[PDB]
Symmetry: C2
Subunit: 125 residues, 2 copies
């Protein structure tokens, strides 16, 4: 009947996450729960409070994320797993490539993110 | 090293050894209902996955992993995410991103979900 439900939920989750992330990241605690984990550039952060503190303490003033590709699959436990490849433009930094993964689980009519992994692509010099 | 990094690191070592040497042996780490998204195309089920990876058009391929990040999920799975570089035959080196969702099924870790993309 056209687009599978994990494609519609994943894609709208990605679009909402990056709108929040580009504009106000203290509002990012709404998509995460107490058991969520975040791995940002190799460092692991357990729990909502440590996740939000970490994303609020980034040194960028202005950030613009652009998605180059997004791939969404259902998992066997009924979760949605998404892989994002994109580009970041922060302040006057040079444009960086990134990869990001999100694991989504339906808890009380809302799809929340239990697991989030982020890593910047390094330029080979 | 935490327990999910030990399992993830071993899975990745196993996957890339088979991928670089004999890709018809890659159905060993997948189950029947695994799903693969390779460069935006979806390959469903073990038989479609192994066909696709066995039929890639190169003879010799070497991957190197640049970064590898591993997490446990609340439902007993591991998420493994990799950034690397590939050298296939005599083509130029290509960058890649790969993601694996591992689940413990019948006492062994298997891949259920696999997503691959080339860095353009």
């Amino acid at each position: 009947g056209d687009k599978p439900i994990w494609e519609q939920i994943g894609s709208s989750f990605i679009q909402h996450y990056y709108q929040l992330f580009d504009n106000d990241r203290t509002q990012l605690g709404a998509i995460y729960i107490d058991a969520s984990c975040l791995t940002w550039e190799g460092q692991q952060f357990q729990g909502k409070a440590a996740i939000v503190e970490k994303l609020s303490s980034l040194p960028f003033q202005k950030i613009q994320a652009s998605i180059t590709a997004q791939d969404h699959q259902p998992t066997p436990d009924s979760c949605i797993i998404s892989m994002v490849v994109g580009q970041l433009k922060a302040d006057e930094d040079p444009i960086m490539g990134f990869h990001q993964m999100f694991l989504l689980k339906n808890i009380n009519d809302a799809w929340v993110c239990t697991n989030d992994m982020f890593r910047l692509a390094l330029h080979n010099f």
